[PDB]
Design a protein around this motif. Structure first.
Motif, PDB file in Angstrom:
ATOM      1  N   UNK A 124       0.771  -1.273   0.000  1.00  0.00           N
ATOM      2  CA  UNK A 124       0.000   0.000   0.000  1.00  0.00           C
ATOM      3  C   UNK A 124       0.795   1.313   0.000  1.00  0.00           C
ATOM      4  N   UNK A 125       1.985   1.312   0.587  1.00  0.00           N
ATOM      5  CA  UNK A 125       2.760   2.550   0.690  1.00  0.00           C
ATOM      6  C   UNK A 125       3.560   2.988  -0.548  1.00  0.00           C
ATOM      7  N   UNK A 126       3.695   2.166  -1.575  1.00  0.00           N
ATOM      8  CA  UNK A 126       4.348   2.661  -2.796  1.00  0.00           C
ATOM      9  C   UNK A 126       3.409   3.571  -3.578  1.00  0.00           C
ATOM     10  N   UNK A 127       2.124   3.424  -3.287  1.00  0.00           N
ATOM     11  CA  UNK A 127       1.080   4.271  -3.852  1.00  0.00           C
ATOM     12  C   UNK A 127       1.232   5.673  -3.250  1.00  0.00           C
ATOM     13  N   UNK A 128       1.872   5.720  -2.066  1.00  0.00           N
ATOM     14  CA  UNK A 128       2.197   6.979  -1.372  1.00  0.00           C
ATOM     15  C   UNK A 128       2.889   7.939  -2.342  1.00  0.00           C
ATOM     16  N   UNK A 129       3.614   7.377  -3.315  1.00  0.00           N
ATOM     17  CA  UNK A 129       4.280   8.165  -4.359  1.00  0.00           C
ATOM     18  C   UNK A 129       3.279   9.138  -5.016  1.00  0.00           C
ATOM     19  N   UNK A 130       1.982   8.840  -4.867  1.00  0.00           N
ATOM     20  CA  UNK A 130       0.906   9.701  -5.368  1.00  0.00           C
ATOM     21  C   UNK A 130       0.974  11.085  -4.735  1.00  0.00           C
ATOM     22  N   UNK A 131       1.389  11.119  -3.480  1.00  0.00           N
ATOM     23  CA  UNK A 131       1.582  12.362  -2.725  1.00  0.00           C
ATOM     24  C   UNK A 131       2.784  13.123  -3.284  1.00  0.00           C
ATOM     25  N   UNK A 132       3.664  12.366  -3.919  1.00  0.00           N
ATOM     26  CA  UNK A 132       4.821  12.909  -4.617  1.00  0.00           C
ATOM     27  C   UNK A 132       4.411  13.259  -6.067  1.00  0.00           C
ATOM     28  N   UNK A 133       3.205  12.814  -6.429  1.00  0.00           N
ATOM     29  CA  UNK A 133       2.574  13.165  -7.704  1.00  0.00           C
ATOM     30  C   UNK A 133       1.686  14.407  -7.488  1.00  0.00           C
ATOM     31  N   UNK A 134       1.216  14.550  -6.237  1.00  0.00           N
ATOM     32  CA  UNK A 134       0.375  15.676  -5.813  1.00  0.00           C
ATOM     33  C   UNK A 134       1.103  17.000  -6.000  1.00  0.00           C
ATOM     34  N   UNK A 135       2.391  16.991  -5.684  1.00  0.00           N
ATOM     35  CA  UNK A 135       3.236  18.167  -5.861  1.00  0.00           C
ATOM     36  C   UNK A 135       3.404  18.480  -7.347  1.00  0.00           C
ATOM     37  N   UNK A 136       3.565  17.436  -8.169  1.00  0.00           N
ATOM     38  CA  UNK A 136       3.654  17.630  -9.616  1.00  0.00           C
ATOM     39  C   UNK A 136       2.366  18.288 -10.118  1.00  0.00           C
ATOM     40  N   UNK A 137       1.243  17.831  -9.568  1.00  0.00           N
ATOM     41  CA  UNK A 137      -0.063  18.411  -9.872  1.00  0.00           C
ATOM     42  C   UNK A 137      -0.093  19.875  -9.433  1.00  0.00           C
ATOM     43  N   UNK A 138       0.505  20.133  -8.283  1.00  0.00           N
ATOM     44  CA  UNK A 138       0.586  21.483  -7.747  1.00  0.00           C
ATOM     45  C   UNK A 138       1.352  22.438  -8.673  1.00  0.00           C
ATOM     46  N   UNK A 139       2.457  21.975  -9.287  1.00  0.00           N
ATOM     47  CA  UNK A 139       3.233  22.866 -10.166  1.00  0.00           C
ATOM     48  C   UNK A 139       2.374  23.313 -11.365  1.00  0.00           C
ATOM     49  N   UNK A 140       1.579  22.372 -11.912  1.00  0.00           N
ATOM     50  CA  UNK A 140       0.745  22.658 -13.080  1.00  0.00           C
ATOM     51  C   UNK A 140      -0.403  23.594 -12.749  1.00  0.00           C
ATOM     52  N   UNK A 141      -0.899  23.541 -11.518  1.00  0.00           N
ATOM     53  CA  UNK A 141      -1.954  24.457 -11.119  1.00  0.00           C
ATOM     54  C   UNK A 141      -1.444  25.893 -11.215  1.00  0.00           C
ATOM     55  N   UNK A 142      -0.200  26.097 -10.770  1.00  0.00           N
ATOM     56  CA  UNK A 142       0.435  27.408 -10.858  1.00  0.00           C
ATOM     57  C   UNK A 142       0.515  27.850 -12.332  1.00  0.00           C
ATOM     58  N   UNK A 143       1.036  26.915 -13.136  1.00  0.00           N
ATOM     59  CA  UNK A 143       1.224  27.053 -14.590  1.00  0.00           C
ATOM     60  C   UNK A 143      -0.038  27.255 -15.448  1.00  0.00           C
ATOM     61  N   UNK A 144      -1.050  26.406 -15.235  1.00  0.00           N
ATOM     62  CA  UNK A 144      -2.251  26.432 -16.082  1.00  0.00           C
ATOM     63  C   UNK A 144      -3.531  26.837 -15.365  1.00  0.00           C
ATOM     64  N   UNK A 145      -4.034  28.014 -15.687  1.00  0.00           N
ATOM     65  CA  UNK A 145      -5.296  28.477 -15.121  1.00  0.00           C
ATOM     66  C   UNK A 145      -5.787  29.759 -15.784  1.00  0.00           C
ATOM     67  N   UNK A 146      -4.822  30.570 -16.251  1.00  0.00           N
ATOM     68  CA  UNK A 146      -5.097  31.904 -16.799  1.00  0.00           C
ATOM     69  C   UNK A 146      -5.425  32.787 -15.603  1.00  0.00           C
TER      70      UNK A 146
END
Lengths: 485, 513, 513
Positions: free
Chosen positions: B110-132
């Motif tokens: 179950x904890x290798x899925x934790x990497x998703x939280x390390x994917x959450x930050x990647x998601x965070x960078x794009x929020x900054x980038x894409x929104x107008x």
């Protein structure tokens, strides 16, 4: 007051239970690590039966009240046409039911969801014309002849450690088989001495029988005689025989001792108790004959002449029928080392033939190992996003269904299920069709290199088959009243 | 049977239950057709309270054993930094838990899925980038002063018939407030009179109280006196005893001593020229009569909260014992009067020297709902202060959420191995937000999701959920925008909050029985 | 409904059960992908205490009736010898019990088998000579100061991103420590502030307490006073009883007597120029008023452990009765002040003349997981002191364990009769360690064992278990090393605790309902 009133919430469950019950038994069967199963029943059933093929067992029985009898019956039409590949079609139909638990959370209208089945008919054709994959597999084929589909069917079988080489041989057998000649005259045996290759191919039919130790070693400009009735009279047989030049006689039963003395002096080779299965195959091969009473010689019998002889094969001596004019029918010998593993070669030649006959008629193929599956998924996932309103959940759900197939292949292997999914999708996304799931690798690889390819028929009607029984669930709402709840 | 013992999956469930329980009450609160909830208790609570703002209700109460109170505490910091808009951050963290059921389907680590939280930050960078975002905030500004972010906060509330006009008014209030001052002295009260404007802006401060029916009607060059202590005198905590004197003749002294309080209040007050006396508490009856003849207006039980703002306004004064008159008291003087605002009598304090503190008294069309202005004005204050400081905004109505969701689906397939499953689960989390916004609108949630998704795909940042429409429309035309700060901080907070406890399997025992 | 009732063979099982329950909780902890668990208790326990380190949590609580506490206690002696890195010693003992199922099958004399632990005595020796390469750590050490074993202890822990830097800091602390001092006066505390460094080194000592709201904020050229006896006075050893007296003036005299204690404290405090008073216990209220006006800062209930270290640091003092000020008190003076670290209030003692003892203060994210820094930190100081003293080490990641396991298999066949069964059971005890390291990594344990054995068998000592790799790799590049001492003591230690388990078997309880 009696009947069967379960509805909506309760009604959904009866269909749902039938699908889950079948899926667990059939999933084990799929791919390299598949297992055989034993079943028995009272009333009209003798004892426990074990079948490798999922389709054979489902048809032989009608065990209980829940509906699944109709769903099962359809797969045979598929079998008569393409059939086995690897058994996966039943599994896909079953998995569509799991999302229904999710559907309760949807909390609005299951009827609206039905739109997806109508979508599914178009989705069925998303499999076709939505991506290029491969297609070739023309006919005959130099390098794409095998090292493909036979290996995939073969994979479920244990023998795959050295059997893959044997599986590869099978296509050559079918290439000669093709045309409208018919599907017959295929014979396989194994030998107690040999090599690493573990297999050999013979130009003609191979039979392990002899008249006796006496009689001429070799016959030329051979005439072949087949008799329905046994030899179990001496003068009629010789007089007719000499004029023809009779080189060999084949009888499908016990043979009277008296004729044996005459055959030896004449110079004629006869076969005692030849099997019927070999004979029918041989008849189509020679050009046939009309077999009846001793009147049978001359031209009521058609004899093909090339050469019939007994030929040394790396140890014991066997009789070879070869150089047949028809060319339609041929046989594969196989070689070994008296190994337990060697008689094993018997197990997979039989499955290899079944996929191949279909491979020649469709003259179309797709990449196996789930290559097509991820690729369709990549193409279909955005289609649902593209469509407005209610429709996207329906179309997307079918699209997400494709995602599980890569996963099912991975689970049997024993590698991490989540890991397998991500790596797979990127390769397909790039645009390389030959890329697919490698179970041994644990990742992705070139499917063509390993082999595995899938017959075109299995893909076109698996999708049609899935919708054959899946829609008759939620779609009709009447089965009612009698007692409370 | 019972002991509070947890095993593998069950431990996961306790985290799971907290997330789902909070989400259902909160989800109906998001957007234009949000719902108000009322809470009561028998003691240490006096009445039912209804809080539109999700963050405020969660902070006050710790109902039960399962963890969730600490997760809740996080939104406070966000609120003081950027504030509100609509409460959506709590819901997003909760939905992350739903995939976990599919996780046991994994039948693996179950904890290798934790990497998703390390994917959450990647998601965070794009929020900054894409929104107008936006370009422009001149200062004060002519047309772009509002019709923006205040409206989105208001959109969540049904007042948006005549009210969107009121929101527009609020920026004028913020322009004076703007800068150094921080948040203080903003007061709002309703009026029972109908008008198109439905609101008026006042330079000073309104307080609703009167000395009594008698007293001078108006005072000018007003002097203000605030007292921490009441005009009431007789106990002293330590009584001094029941008391002994020398019979009835001297007790006359006791009654007489009351008069001395009266004498001090008049003589000293007159020299100053005292126009208005404001006391935060009960006021003794004897002084009341004195004020009327003198020409001085006093206020009985004037509450403290109005007073502290008032002190900043007049330069303040040191409130103590009756020595309090003269210089220790600083009374600003312009105009203090009680003015009929057509409807109900109120007192206007105005002409404040400081200028920092001002009052937004709004009139508007009447019903119980004009009390809504109290609800609604508070929202206006928080959004403008942030809007001026950030000079950045994003499109509201869930426009931001669908765009990001389309982008993340592609990302899962591209990343190899372990990572896509983790990334795709974070990615489909975004899908629920369109659904939550649509559901409270009363329109069908399923229909809304695909049509929304198709418009975002085109590249229109402006396109978003139109609840009033029942389908999808152009958010930008509406004028609904969210401040830039709320979106970047929530992404970091949501992932981290849910992440810790999944990590820990087992909330353990005790000693007792 | 309760039954229990255990006899002979089932009695043996109670020893068996204790080992299995402990192993599952501890297995997650060993290795880079470690796990955190939280324990809650009531009754002399506040709440939510979580410990990553297996030794600290087992030692603190004796939860239930089955025997296991004695085994746990033993681990601390190991800790003193060397102890930590990762907690693996307890797990090894637990697996040894699994073979005992085989012993019933063996069906002769279980004590004859006990020869296996004696057999294990030179098994330990075999691993004492053939294992790893890496020796001395010369002195002070430029590059080799760390980036080694402290990092390995940390590798198991999940804070190792920022944290590996923290670990590097700890060796600097040991270098000053180094000398004839041995191992004393080092204290380190985490702080709720956020910085990339996440840590600071203090020249003196750090404490978190305040006199009261009033008092001067900062003191310069400070004199420090430490008192054993509290400021509180009135109840000596014998009361002098509770008495009446008989005058309207005598009850007053006892109040007057209190004033005399006040008088002594101020008059002589001023001559000294005392800037700070630290007392380990409760402090009487009267002096507190006095300190504020004087300009003296004092600390109520300061912890004794902090005080003793501080005394060595400031030259110390004789802590007796109020005669304590002046010459008997040694006060070092540089800077004592409450410093704004970033988020919270702390008091800094600095510029110590002695130099022998120094303090490290950590900064972190916050929430009991920053206590994690205390967890990693405790391990860091202790490992380094013996790494320099032992002058040798062995390869980590289980490299040492597989090699010894290959060697011990040969040994069982070699020993005649009874001994071979006993020796071979000990031999597979080594097999689980590779499995435990792999299991918390989330990778499949079965596959890992087989691949691992082939590499060690081949003859490469450096090769070991790489959790990040998901296979085998070169341990030396990683920088993971284990103290030679941890391996010598653990082999001797495992047998004695485990042996206690076989010798017990019988626990007695009487009857039903």
């Amino acid at each position: 007051a009696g009947a069967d009133e379960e509805r909506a919430e309760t009604a959904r469950l009866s269909s749902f239970i039938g699908a889950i019950a079948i899926g667990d038994l059939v999933k084990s069967t799929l791919g390299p690590k598949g297992m055989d199963k034993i079943l028995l029943s009272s009333g009209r059933d003798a004892s426990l039966m074990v079948t490798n093929d999922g389709a054979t067992i489902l048809k032989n029985i009608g065990v209980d009240n829940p509906a699944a009898k109709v769903l099962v019956d359809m797969s045979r039409v598929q079998d008569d046409e393409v059939g086995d590949g690897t058994t996966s079609v039943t599994v896909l139909a079953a998995e569509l039911l799991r999302e229904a638990e999710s559907l309760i959370a949807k909390k609005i209208h299951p009827q609206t969801i039905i739109a997806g089945w109508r979508e599914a008919t178009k989705a069925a054709r998303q499999a076709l014309l939505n991506s290029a994959v491969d297609h070739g597999s023309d006919e005959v084929k130099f390098r794409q002849d095998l090292m493909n589909i036979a290996g995939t069917t073969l994979s479920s079988k244990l023998l795959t450690h050295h059997k893959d080489h044997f599986t590869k041989l099978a296509v050559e057998a079918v290439l000669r088989l093709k045309g409208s000649g018919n599907l017959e005259a295929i014979h396989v045996i194994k030998k107690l001495g040999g090599s690493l290759a573990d297999s050999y191919l013979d130009e003609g039919f191979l039979l392990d029988k002899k008249i006796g130790v006496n009689q001429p070693k070799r016959i030329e400009n051979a005439k072949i005689l087949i008799a329905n009735t046994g030899m179990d009279k001496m003068k009629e047989k010789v007089e007719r025989i000499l004029k023809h030049g009779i080189n060999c006689f084949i009888n499908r039963q016990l043979i009277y001792n008296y004729p044996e003395q005459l055959f030896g002096a004449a110079g004629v080779m006869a076969i005692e108790h030849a099997d019927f299965v070999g004979v029918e195959r041989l008849a189509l091969v020679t050009g046939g004959e009309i077999a009846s009473t001793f009147d049978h010689p001359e031209l009521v019998k058609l004899g093909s002449c090339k050469l019939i002889e007994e030929v040394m094969i790396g140890e014991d001596k066997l009789i070879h029928f070869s150089g047949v004019a028809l060319g339609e029918a041929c046989t594969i010998v196989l070689r070994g080392a008296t190994q337990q593993i060697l008689d094993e070669a018997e197990r997979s030649l039989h499955d290899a033939l079944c996929v191949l006959a279909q491979t020649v008629k469709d003259s179309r193929t797709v990449y196996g190992g789930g290559c097509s599956e991820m690729l369709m998924a990549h193409a279909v996932t955005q289609l649902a996003s593209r469509t407005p309103g209610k429709e996207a959940v329906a179309m997307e759900s079918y699209a997400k269904a494709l995602r599980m197939l890569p996963t099912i292949i991975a689970d049997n292997a024993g590698y991490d299920s989540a890991d397998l999914v991500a790596q797979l999708r990127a390769a397909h996304s790039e645009g390389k069709t030959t890329a697919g799931l490698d179970m041994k690798e644990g990742t992705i690889g070139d499917m063509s290199v390993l082999g595995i390819t899938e017959s075109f028929q299995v893909k076109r009607q698996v999708l049609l088959s899935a919708a054959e029984a899946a829609e008759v669930i939620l779609r009709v709402d009447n089965i009612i009243k009698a007692a409370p709840r």
